[PDB]
Nucleic acid binder design. Structure first.
Ligand SMILES: [K+]
Ligand SMILES: [Mg+2]
Ligand SMILES: [Mg+2]
Ligand SMILES: [Mg+2]
Ligand SMILES: [Mg+2]
Ligand SMILES: [Mg+2]
Ligand SMILES: [Mg+2]
Ligand SMILES: [Mg+2]
Ligand SMILES: [Mg+2]
Ligand SMILES: [Mg+2]
Ligand SMILES: [Mg+2]
Lengths: 151, 288, 95, 54, 52
RNA sequence: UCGGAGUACAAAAAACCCUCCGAGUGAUUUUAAUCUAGACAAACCAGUCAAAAUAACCAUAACAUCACUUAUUGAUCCAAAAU
């Protein structure tokens, strides 16, 4: 009941009730990204370097929280991470605390969706291995140029 | 149990005539008498060794000493003014609760931790409180309303997962000495003084809502809490619907030290009574 | 070093050591290389880098500096935003 | 190659990776002599700070 | 013949100075050094005389 | 005080008011970066090399060179200059 000139009520007159600080503004952010209730989270701890492997597995085809063009672009780019049964698998090993490992997976998943969502997002790059890959691809096309009746 | 007590019946009575110290506890002293420790007494032969006039410690005989040929650099520059925070781990916080050292039914602050022998705070050695670390965030299943002087992102997220409340408050060394040892203060016969404001250096830490500062604007707490829930992927509990909401919402005025007490009150522990001032100037000074 | 002072009778410390050394809680002491600010244009690129690096002190120097300073500087300190805070404790030391 | 493991061989596709030997370090001395401050970082097990009784 | 030590300041605006030994009879010197501040080679000109 | 040859014949070290040469800097432009594994050397303080990695520029570029090249040099504190 004690009040001073530096109390929160007298410093921020707009909010005075003690219940204001504990409200849940669901309307402010209605996007509701990554509904983790439908994500399969598995923890596997390796103790010896101690780390907690946190993996996020979900069905890409039935994931309805992403758009149809975004859903198929994930399969085109990230086809290396897709399991046989269509389960996209994401794994992290950075931190020892599994809270940070799961947070890293969610942030990594957001970046995968964000760049695939944009139709105009199509960055390119040049790498040291790209040079020899282009050369070995160009060289195998030299022998392919012959065109005679096949089997 | 003690089968040696059976042996004591046969043996004679224990008195001052037959007592022996534990063997090895008292190494005998060696005196410089005899052929062995004699004619030199373990000193040497001539010089500054036998005459006991060797130079000071760190003097290498005219040559520049090792501790004088190293350039000065500031490693301890202003160390007596740097703030120190005793770390508290969630593994220890869980350990205290399981053994009844502290209870989550009652709000927990720095005073309750000291009485529970969880952490020891020395105000003299520039200690400004307790910082919450995230060593045991994975196995923390308790629900508490804890108030500390510094918190980490993972420590706050771990507590809010179970539905707790974390708040950071600043304590001046004059006030922190009173807070850690309240009973000795009440025996000094002095009015409870106002808690001082944080210095300009520590204003941003306790004003931003990311650190759950005590001086922060309460309107930005709910949006900041949900950001942590989104970041770490845990559903944010609705704390207003729990039966302990009254206990979990308890806070302190920035000018207030203890729960329910006010500056200017004198606690007469002998008579179990609380004294309050009446003059307008006294009330204004202790409430401004 | 004043083993016994004339006012309180306790053990004094040498202020020369603290102004130019850092003591980690593991017993290791830290110091700067000698000559890291003198005649930089004369020295090569590798030599300047070597002189700008922090170095440790061997057992005799570490033992010497422990008898020149009192027990206040050997305590465990928890500084806020301390760069050397993670170096305080030793790890994986099979002696 | 992927469809061969799934459709034809009815096999889960195995993925390998080129793993290099771990770096070699000398035996850690109690008092390192004239060594950089990063001498402790070489023998660190993890960069996450670990508190003991605290 | 004595040489002169001169301090050269970067012409890229950043504050970066490295000393260079120069002959006394030579005129003002201008080199092409490499300041890490901009991570690119920039022109350096003689600014001040420090040591002979 | 610092370097080279002999004394010190073949890994290292090794002395004399021992025998002979030197150094206390010039010339030139290729103006020579940041960060780090592992080692030589050593009472200490100092001295030396150095893969990988990053930046610089042939767009997957780090040894400044020559003069027996080896020596061409000075610790703290303190003072002055932009820091
Ligand atoms: K004797
Ligand atoms: Mg004795
Ligand atoms: Mg005696
Ligand atoms: Mg005798
Ligand atoms: Mg005698
Ligand atoms: Mg003698
Ligand atoms: Mg002298
Ligand atoms: Mg303490
Ligand atoms: Mg050796
Ligand atoms: Mg290289
Ligand atoms: Mg001096």
């Amino acid at each position: 009941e004690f009040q001073s000139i530096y109390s929160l009520d007298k410093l921020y007159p707009e909010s005075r009730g003690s219940d204001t600080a504990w409200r849940l503004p669901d309307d402010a952010k209605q996007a509701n990204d990554i509904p983790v209730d439908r994500l399969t989270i598995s923890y596997c701890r390796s103790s010896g370097k101690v780390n907690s492997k946190a993996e996020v597995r979900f069905h890409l085809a039935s994931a309805d929280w992403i758009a149809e063009p975004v859903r198929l672009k994930l399969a085109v780019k990230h086809k290396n991470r897709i399991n046989r049964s269509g389960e996209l698998i994401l794994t992290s090993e950075c931190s020892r605390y599994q809270f940070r490992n799961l947070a890293d997976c969610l942030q990594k998943l957001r970046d995968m969706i964000a760049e695939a969502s944009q139709p105009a997002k199509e960055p390119s790059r040049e790498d040291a291995e790209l040079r020899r890959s282009r050369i070995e691809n160009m060289n195998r096309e030299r022998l392919r140029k012959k065109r005679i009746s096949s089997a | 149990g003690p089968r040696a007590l059976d042996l004591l019946r046969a043996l004679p009575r224990v008195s001052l005539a037959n007592l022996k110290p534990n063997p090895g506890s008292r190494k005998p002293e060696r005196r410089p008498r005899g052929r062995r420790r004699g004619r030199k007494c373990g000193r040497g032969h001539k010089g500054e060794r036998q005459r006991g006039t060797r130079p000071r410690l760190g003097f290498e005989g005219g040559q520049t000493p090792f501790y004088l040929r190293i350039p000065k650099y500031g490693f301890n520059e202003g160390h007596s003014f740097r703030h120190q925070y005793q770390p508290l781990s969630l593994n220890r916080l869980q350990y205290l609760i399981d053994l009844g050292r502290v209870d989550p039914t009652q709000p927990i602050d720095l005073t309750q931790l000291v009485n529970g022998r969880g952490v020891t705070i020395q105000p003299s050695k520039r200690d400004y409180g307790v910082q919450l670390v995230e060593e045991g965030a994975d196995t923390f299943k308790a629900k508490v309303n804890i108030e500390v002087q510094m918190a980490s992102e993972l420590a706050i997220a771990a507590i809010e997962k179970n539905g707790g409340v974390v708040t950071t408050a600043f304590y001046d060394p004059r006030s922190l000495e009173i807070l850690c040892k309240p009973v000795p203060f009440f025996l000094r016969g002095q009015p409870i003084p106002k808690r001082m404001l944080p210095p300009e250096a520590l204003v941003p830490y306790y004003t931003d809502a990311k650190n759950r500062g005590y001086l922060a604007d309460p309107a930005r707490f709910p949006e900041a809490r949900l950001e942590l829930a989104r970041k770490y992927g845990y559903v944010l509990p609705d704390i207003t619907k729990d039966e302990l909401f009254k206990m979990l919402s308890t806070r302190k005025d920035p000018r207030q030290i203890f729960f329910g007490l006010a500056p200017g009150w004198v606690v007469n522990m002998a008579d179990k009574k609380i004294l309050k001032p009446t003059d307008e100037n006294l009330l204004k000074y202790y409430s401004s | 070093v004043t083993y016994f002072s004339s006012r309180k009778g306790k053990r004094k410390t040498v202020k020369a050591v603290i102004y130019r050394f850092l003591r980690l809680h593991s017993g290791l002491w830290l110091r700067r290389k000698a000559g890291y600010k003198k005649k930089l244009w004369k020295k090569t690129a590798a030599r300047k880098r070597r002189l700008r690096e922090f170095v440790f002190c061997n057992k005799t120097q570490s033992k010497l500096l422990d008898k020149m300073t009192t027990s206040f500087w050997k305590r465990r300190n928890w500084y806020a935003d301390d760069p050397y805070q993670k170096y305080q404790d030793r790890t994986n030391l099979k002696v | 190659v992927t469809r061969v493991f799934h459709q034809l061989l009815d096999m889960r596709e195995p993925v390998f990776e080129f793993v290099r030997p771990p770096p070699y370090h000398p035996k850690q001395k109690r008092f390192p002599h004239r060594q950089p401050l990063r001498y402790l970082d070489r023998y660190r097990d993890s960069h996450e700070p670990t508190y003991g009784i605290y | 013949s004595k040489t002169i030590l001169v301090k050269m300041m970067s012409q890229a605006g950043t504050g970066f100075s490295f000393n260079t030994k120069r002959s006394r009879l030579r005129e003002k010197l201008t080199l092409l050094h490499y300041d890490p501040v901009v991570k690119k080679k920039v022109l350096f000109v003689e600014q001040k005389k420090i040591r002979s």
